């Protein structure tokens, strides 16, 4: 169930513009960079404490 739910949450990055280590996001683009993705994934994991994961 946790794998299926994580696949649900991560589906939003399909086709999304990604700006890698080289530079950052300019103005008006709908892209993202690995740090923001990691932060959002951490937020999603934290919000599911008590139903899927342990405390931490």
């Amino acid at each position: 169930a946790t794998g299926v739910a994580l696949a649900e949450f991560l589906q939003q990055f399909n086709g999304l513009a990604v700006f890698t280590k080289n530079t950052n996001i300019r103005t008006g683009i709908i892209g993202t960079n690995p740090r923001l993705m990691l932060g959002k994934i951490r937020k999603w994991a934290q919000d599911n404490v008590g139903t899927l994961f342990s405390e931490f």
Partner: protein, 130 residues
């Protein structure tokens, strides 16, 4: 990195009536005032003999941004839920989800100050912690 400032601001708009999602669109800082944070979801109060009363409260964010001309101005003044994501220069990332604008101000149509409220705001704490 000894450089205080923001590098990217991402906002996602969710209209409260039509349930349409737009974003995450990068945004632009209007002036020299940086976004201001408050993570502790409890508001304390001074009492006597050093005691303190802990009352439940909300996590806020004062985020001044430049509006995007492809987004209606009403979205920045409480007509849509916001999913804000701000990354500082020193690697810190503030993540906010399911926010709301509480006290909209009379804006001139270019720069808007967003008083956002969420249950809790995440911190990324660039490597090396505790």
């Amino acid at each position: 990195n000894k450089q205080n400032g923001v590098k990217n601001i991402l906002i996602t708009f969710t209209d409260c009536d039509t349930q349409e999602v737009i974003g995450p669109i990068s945004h632009e800082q209007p002036d020299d005032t940086l976004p201001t944070y408050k993570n502790c979801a409890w508001t304390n109060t001074a009492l006597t003999n050093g005691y303190v009363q802990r009352s439940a409260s909300n996590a806020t964010m004062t985020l001044p941004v430049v509006r995007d001309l492809r987004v209606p101005l009403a979205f920045y003044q409480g007509c849509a839920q916001v999913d804000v994501q701000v990354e500082k220069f020193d690697g810190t990332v503030m993540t906010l989800t399911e926010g709301a604008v509480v006290e909209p101000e009379e804006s001139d149509g270019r720069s808007v100050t967003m008083n956002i409220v969420a249950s809790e705001i995440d911190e990324l704490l660039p490597p090396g912690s505790l």
